[PDB]
Amino acid sequence: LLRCRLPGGVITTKQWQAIDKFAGENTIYGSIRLTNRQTFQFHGILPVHQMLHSVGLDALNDMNRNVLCTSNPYESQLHAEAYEWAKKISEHLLPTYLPRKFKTTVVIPPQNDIDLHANDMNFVAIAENGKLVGFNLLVGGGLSIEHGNKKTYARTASEFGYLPLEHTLAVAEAVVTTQRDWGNRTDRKNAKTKYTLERVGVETFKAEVERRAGIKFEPIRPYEFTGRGDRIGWVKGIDDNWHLTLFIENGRILDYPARPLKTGLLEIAKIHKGDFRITANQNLIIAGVPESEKAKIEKIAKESGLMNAVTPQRENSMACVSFPTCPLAMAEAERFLPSFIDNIDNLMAKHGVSDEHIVMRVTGCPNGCGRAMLAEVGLVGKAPGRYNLHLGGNRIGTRIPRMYKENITEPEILASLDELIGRWAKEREAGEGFGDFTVRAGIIRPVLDPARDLWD
Ligand code: SRM
Ligand code: SF4
Ligand SMILES: [K+]
């Protein structure tokens, strides 16, 4: 288990060739596993640092995780600056010993693909005239819980306010240090920013950030999100450039019989002009393809099975690694997802909603790596073949799903979803999401204040 520091998930093709080689000749699984934090992982490393170092990559005492950045903004020009800022916060936060690991993102509305509410510190980009002018700071998200422990909880991030671009690093540092100092010194399970905020108060925390940063936040500038999914397929970028996002189930890059995904990405990397972007959804964007290069790239991706069409449901589903490599796994996630969505696809078709989607996620244990706690339908592993079923989140990821059923099996999960989806298909309003609907229809009470009403 080695993991690289790759802000915004942008990786060059040169770097891609060096990791593809290593993955194949020096690991048990021979795979490249894209993670939901925009970086990659090798599994079963049988040196790695000199390999990383040689292509300019570095492997992260440091309580800092990979800083995310919206990978494919609708206003393509905004990416360059937002990415430059992600990269700067990354290097800036690089060595203080934090009580718990600190997660940070730079978001570009209206896309919340980086799933901000799962993170400690978030900078929501505010642009004017195609230029970033500042950020809206949201602080305090975290998804990890412990089964049966009502003192733990998933929490969404809180809005602190707006800050001009210039005050970015000072604020970033102030948040880190204030969590570092105020973080719970007695228990590690209460040491996350989300716990500290609830202990001292958002306002008490905010006032301190201001004092330390040397500024005063301005009121939050309007922003809204419309989704969290990737833009699978070709999208027009700036100039004559195009972006091809490839759907990769579980982000597992390996050559399968008749679907050489791994060789396919290597072939593309060899003729690709720009670079690649690893998404927060475990997919890969072949970025900056000249219009003239579209057919060449598409030809390879197509041959390799990288462009095999899947349903919208599949494209919007996610699972953590879990078995066989995770030591904390309670139930299958990655290896369970595919056949599981095979089942969901059938139920979707049975209900005439095959063109629809439900943000469906499966996490192998309460730690929550699969981000099931921000899904419309989340599966939290409890034991082999068993999961806690949570319902009631939303498409954009701003609501925590309450536990609906506990410790049940797939046949039981499927039987419950069969009935709920059927109701949704027939009783929903125009454009109404499944999560919102379960809450509107009274199928599940909403979680309005995580720290106080997440547990029944
Ligand atoms: C690879 C990935 C899930 C995936 O399939 O993509 C993952 C994989 C692993 N996670 Fe994670 N988590 C991943 C994103 C996160 C997420 C979601 C996110 O960050 O977007 C969270 C939930 C949000 C949160 O932090 O609250 C998450 C919360 C945890 C926790 C709980 C931490 C806590 O505060 O309690 C742990 C366990 C721990 O460290 O105590 C952890 C533990 C672990 C490790 C590294 C297991 C371990 O501690 O030894 C899991 C490794 C499995 C394996 O064999 O590879 N992981 N994990 C993600 C790696 C991200 C990265 O590149 O750094
Ligand atoms: S959620 Fe649990 S099982 Fe899944 S990858 Fe994270 S630690 Fe392992
Ligand atoms: K994926």
Residue pair 194/99 in contact (Cβ under 8 Å)? The answer is no
For 87, phi and psi rounded to 5 degrees? -60, -35
* Cα–Cα distance measured from residue 388 to residue 413, given in angstroms and rounded to the nearest whole number: 9
Instruction: State the catalytic residue, choosing from 369, 371, 382, 395.
Output: 369
* Cα–Cα distance measured from residue 277 to residue 248, given in angstroms and rounded to the nearest whole number: 13
* Cα–Cα distance measured from residue 250 to residue 333, given in angstroms and rounded to the nearest whole number: 9
> Which of 310, 338, 354 represents a domain boundary (last residue)?
310
Are residues 38 and 68 located together in one domain of the fold? no
> In the annotation, is 296 catalytic?
no
Nearest alpha-carbon partner for 86 in 253, 280, 234: 280
* Cα–Cα distance measured from residue 250 to residue 334, given in angstroms and rounded to the nearest whole number: 6
Are residues 221 and 239 located together in one domain of the fold? no
Q: Between 261-271 and 13-25, two packed helices, what is the crossing angle to 10 degrees?
A: 150
**Residue for token digits 């422990």?**
149
- Token couple for 422: 């059927």
CA 299 to chain centre: 29
What is the experimental resolution, given in Å to one decimal place?
2.1
Task: Report the nearest-CA residue for atom 12 of ligand 1.
Answer: 369
Q: How far is the CA of 185 from the centre of ligand 2 (A)?
A: 25
| Helix runs in 3-77, H state only | 13-25, 48-54
78 lines ligand 1 (CB under 6 A): no
* Cα–Cα distance measured from residue 171 to residue 122, given in angstroms and rounded to the nearest whole number: 11
* Cα–Cα distance measured from residue 167 to residue 215, given in angstroms and rounded to the nearest whole number: 8
Q: Between 202-213 and 168-182, two packed helices, what is the crossing angle to 10 degrees?
A: 130
Nearest alpha-carbon partner for 416 in 407, 425, 404: 404
80 lines ligand 2 (CB under 6 A): no
> In the annotation, is 320 catalytic?
yes
* Cα–Cα distance measured from residue 276 to residue 287, given in angstroms and rounded to the nearest whole number: 5
Instruction: State the catalytic residue, choosing from 14, 101, 211, 445.
Output: 101
Indicate if the alpha-carbon torsion angle 76, 81, 83, 86 is positive or negative: negative
Are residues 211 and 233 located together in one domain of the fold? no
To 5 degrees, how large is the angle CA 379–CA 254–CA 332?
20
To 5 degrees, how large is the angle CA 230–CA 232–CA 238?
85
> Which of 255, 288, 310 represents a domain boundary (last residue)?
310
Are residues 235 and 358 located together in one domain of the fold? no
Are residues 338 and 389 located together in one domain of the fold? yes
For 335, residues 6+ apart whose C-beta sits below 8 A from its C-beta are 322, 323, 324
Which of 149, 337, 367 has the most ligand 1 atoms within 8 A of CB, as the residue to mutate? 367
250 lines ligand 2 (CB under 6 A): no
Residue pair 334/252 in contact (Cβ under 8 Å)? The answer is yes
Residue pair 8/38 in contact (Cβ under 8 Å)? The answer is yes
Nearest alpha-carbon partner for 158 in 88, 103, 216, 205: 205
- Token couple for 273: 């002009």
363 lines ligand 1 (CB under 6 A): no
Q: Between 410-427 and 337-350, two packed helices, what is the crossing angle to 10 degrees?
A: 30
Residue 189: count other Cβ atoms within 10 Å of its Cβ.
Answer: 15
174 lines ligand 2 (CB under 6 A): no
- Token couple for 104: 């940070």
| Type of residue numbered 153 | Y
* Cα–Cα distance measured from residue 405 to residue 443, given in angstroms and rounded to the nearest whole number: 11
For 233, phi and psi rounded to 5 degrees? 110, -165
Q: How far is the CA of 241 from the centre of ligand 1 (A)?
A: 34
* Cα–Cα distance measured from residue 185 to residue 195, given in angstroms and rounded to the nearest whole number: 12
CATH of the domain at 432: 3.30.413.10
**Residue for token digits 């809005």?**
159
CATH of the domain at 31: 3.90.480.10
Q: How many CA atoms lie within 13 Å of 27's alpha carbon, on the beta-carbon side?
A: 21
DSSP 27: B
Are residues 361 and 375 located together in one domain of the fold? yes
Are residues 141 and 200 located together in one domain of the fold? yes
> Which of 282, 310, 338 represents a domain boundary (last residue)?
310
Q: How far is the CA of 329 from the centre of ligand 2 (A)?
A: 5
Q: Are strands 252-253 and 360-363 parallel, antiparallel or unpaired?
A: unpaired
> In the annotation, is 69 catalytic?
no
> In the annotation, is 101 catalytic?
yes
For 67, residues 6+ apart whose C-beta sits below 8 A from its C-beta are 7, 8, 86, 87, 89, 90, 93, 104, 105, 106
DSSP 367: T
- Binding positions are 320, 326, 365, 369
Give the SS3 label for residue 43.
Answer: coil
Residue pair 158/111 in contact (Cβ under 8 Å)? The answer is no
* Cα–Cα distance measured from residue 454 to residue 450, given in angstroms and rounded to the nearest whole number: 5
Q: How many CA atoms lie within 13 Å of 110's alpha carbon, on the beta-carbon side?
A: 7
Are residues 289 and 317 located together in one domain of the fold? no
The total number of structural domains in the chain stands at 3
Q: Are strands 377-383 and 233-236 parallel, antiparallel or unpaired?
A: unpaired
* Cα–Cα distance measured from residue 165 to residue 126, given in angstroms and rounded to the nearest whole number: 9
Nearest alpha-carbon partner for 217 in 142, 130, 131, 124: 124
Are residues 70 and 210 located together in one domain of the fold? yes
Element containing residue 10 per DSSP (H, E): strand 10-11
Are residues 190 and 330 located together in one domain of the fold? no
Residues counted in the chain: 456
Sheet arrangement for strand 58-59: 58-59, 2-5, 40-42, 32-34, 252-253
* Cα–Cα distance measured from residue 269 to residue 172, given in angstroms and rounded to the nearest whole number: 35
For 184, residues 6+ apart whose C-beta sits below 8 A from its C-beta are 99, 190, 191, 195, 196, 199
Residue 74: count other Cβ atoms within 10 Å of its Cβ.
Answer: 13
**Residues around ligand 3, an ion, CB closer than 5 A:** 282-283
Helix, strand, coil % in the chain, rounded to nearest 5: 35, 25, 40
For 178, phi and psi rounded to 5 degrees? -70, -35
Exposed / middle / buried, residue 270 (Cβ in 10 Å: 0-12, 13-18, 19+):
exposed
Task: Report the nearest-CA residue for atom 13 of ligand 1.
Answer: 369
Task: Report the nearest-CA residue for atom 6 of ligand 1.
Answer: 35
- The reply to whether omega before 324 is within 30° of 0 (cis) is yes
Nearest alpha-carbon partner for 132 in 86, 68, 66, 65: 86
Are residues 165 and 111 located together in one domain of the fold? yes
**Host domain of residue 441:** 311-453
Residue pair 415/397 in contact (Cβ under 8 Å)? The answer is no
* Cα–Cα distance measured from residue 224 to residue 112, given in angstroms and rounded to the nearest whole number: 9
Give the SS3 label for residue 34.
Answer: strand
Indicate if the alpha-carbon torsion angle 366, 149, 122, 235 is positive or negative: positive
User: How much is the CA Rg of the chain, to the nearest whole Å?
Assistant: 21
Element containing residue 31 per DSSP (H, E): none
Give the SS3 label for residue 320.
Answer: coil
Task: Provide the β-strand partners of residue 363.
Answer: 380
Are residues 69 and 205 located together in one domain of the fold? yes
- Binding positions for siroheme are 369
Q: How far is the CA of 324 from the centre of ligand 2 (A)?
A: 11
As a three-state string, the secondary structure of 215-273 is: CCCECCCCCCCCECCCCCEEEECCCCEEEEEECCHHHEECEECCEEHHHHHHHHHHHCC
Task: Provide the β-strand partners of residue 83.
Answer: none
Q: Are strands 317-319 and 360-363 parallel, antiparallel or unpaired?
A: parallel
319 lines ligand 2 (CB under 6 A): no
